[PDB]
Amino acid sequence: SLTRIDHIGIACHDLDATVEFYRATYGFEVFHTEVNEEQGVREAMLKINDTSDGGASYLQLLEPTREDSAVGKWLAKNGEGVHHIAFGTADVDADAADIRDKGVRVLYDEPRRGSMGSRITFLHPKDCHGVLTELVTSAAVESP
Amino acid sequence: SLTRIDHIGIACHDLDATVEFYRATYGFEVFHTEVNEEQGVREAMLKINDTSDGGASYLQLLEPTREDSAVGKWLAKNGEGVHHIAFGTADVDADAADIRDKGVRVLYDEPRRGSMGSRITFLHPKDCHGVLTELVTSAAVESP
Numbered sequence: 511s512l513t514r515i516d517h518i519g520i521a522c523h524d525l526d527a528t529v530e531f532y533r534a535t536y537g538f539e540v541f542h543t544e545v546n547e548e549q550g551v552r553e554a555m556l557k558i559n560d561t562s563d564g565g566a567s568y569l570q571l572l573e574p575t576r577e578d579s580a581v582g583k584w585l586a587k588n589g590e591g592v593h594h595i596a597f598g599t600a601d602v603d604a605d606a607a608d609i610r611d612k613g614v615r616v617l618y619d620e621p622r623r624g625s626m627g628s629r630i631t632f633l634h635p636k637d638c639h640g641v642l643t644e645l646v647t648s649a650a651v652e653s654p
Numbered sequence: 655s656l657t658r659i660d661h662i663g664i665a666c667h668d669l670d671a672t673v674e675f676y677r678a679t680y681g682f683e684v685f686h687t688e689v690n691e692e693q694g695v696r697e698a699m700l701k702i703n704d705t706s707d708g709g710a711s712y713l714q715l716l717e718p719t720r721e722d723s724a725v726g727k728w729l730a731k732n733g734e735g736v737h738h739i740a741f742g743t744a745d746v747d748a749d750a751a752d753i754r755d756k757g758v759r760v761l762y763d764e765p766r767r768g769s770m771g772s773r774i775t776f777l778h779p780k781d782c783h784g785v786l787t788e789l790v791t792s793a794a795v796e797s798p
């Protein structure tokens with residue numbers, strides 16, 4: 511079951527400038543930073559709150575590492591802004607198979623690595639009324 | 655202080671079809687529906703989780719009531735998808751004045767009515783790295 515909003519994925523041209531914007535404006539601090547070469551992003555997670563399923567909700571700021579990447583192509587076309595939304599689950603494999611069985615395109619056969627060792631998959635935006643939708647199970651199991 | 659992600663605002667051409675998509679695909683149910691004639695939207699709120707500040711996080715699905723509206727103009731230009739993100743606070747007036755004092759454009763002098771009697775304001779997306787950003791204080795005060 512999808513039990514939380516895990517994060518909002520926000521594309522930006524300059525991760526350090528956009529991180530500073532969120533810190534200066536709202537007081538949000540960096541929870542974690544990492545580079546995901548497979549996905550082609552430099553990322554910062556800003557934790558906004560904890561959630562009733564034992565998880566948390568984040569802003570995921572993403573700068574592309576290369577133009578020929580999901581985020582690089584999106585930024586080139588649309589400019590900075592919201593790129594995707596992510597829902598958390600305790601079993602991304604099972605929820606992804608259930609959604610596959612409804613005819614919504616699941617982009618990965620098997621979940622891939624996301625932030626902080628998480629396991630993630632994505633739903634095609636054209637099957638989701640224009641929203642690129644991520645499913646995520648945190649690496650650390652959560653106590654509701 | 656901004657203590658949660660309150661909601662993701664998602665623009666759609668047909669509220670009933672998009673509500674059904676979210677119910678069928680994810681099992682999300684309708685928390686509330688309403689029409690906001692001032693804003694020019696028919697809205698459905700789907701509650702995804704509660705939050706550690708005593709509030710909750712929602713998907714806010716929005717169909718325009720007229721083409722000459724914030725959402726109607728946005729849909730015409732961009733098609734369906736994420737329209738805005740909203741942060742919750744216990745004092746939207748005070749947080750909006752603090753952000754105004756940083757030079758970020760605050761769209762309302764005084765907060766306006768949002769979903770479920772809430773009081774809301776918005777930050778200009780061109781001041782927020784391309785994200786239309788809403789600030790919201792729930793009508794019912796929250797116990798962290």
Ligand SMILES: CC(C)(COP(=O)(O)OP(=O)(O)OC[C@H]1O[C@@H](n2cnc3c(N)ncnc32)[C@H](O)[C@@H]1OP(=O)(O)O)[C@@H](O)C(=O)NCCC(=O)NCCCC(=O)O
Nearest residue numbers: 519549580581583584593594617624625632635640641642
């Ligand atoms: C979603 C998609 C397959 C798009 O790839 P692709 O089809 O090659 O790019 P595209 O430009 O041709 O898009 C096809 C359609 O999807 C739409 N689209 C693409 N990215 C979109 C997005 N982020 N949101 C909404 N719609 C999107 C395009 O506008 C296009 O629509 P049209 O038919 O109207 O032109 C691809 O970006 C993808 O696999 N994404 C998942 C991985 C990812 O996003 N990683 C970065 C984040 C990592 C993380 O969060 O950890």
Ligand SMILES: CC(C)(COP(=O)(O)OP(=O)(O)OC[C@H]1O[C@@H](n2cnc3c(N)ncnc32)[C@H](O)[C@@H]1OP(=O)(O)O)[C@@H](O)C(=O)NCCC(=O)NCCCC(=O)O
Nearest residue numbers: 663693724725727728737738761768769776779784785786
């Ligand atoms: C944000 C804005 C003032 C845009 O109005 P306006 O400037 O007249 O439309 P516009 O098409 O000319 O946009 C100006 C720029 O903002 C960008 N923009 C507009 N809406 C945007 C959005 N939702 N997200 C990101 N960028 C946005 C445009 O692309 C344009 O950028 P360019 O200079 O690159 O062209 C306006 O939509 C607004 O006041 N919004 C707040 C109210 C609202 O959105 N209500 C609906 C939701 C209600 C609720 O959540 O309860």
Ligand SMILES: [Co+2]
Nearest residue numbers: 519570596644
């Ligand atoms: Co993500």
Ligand SMILES: [Co+2]
Nearest residue numbers: 663714740788
């Ligand atoms: Co809103």
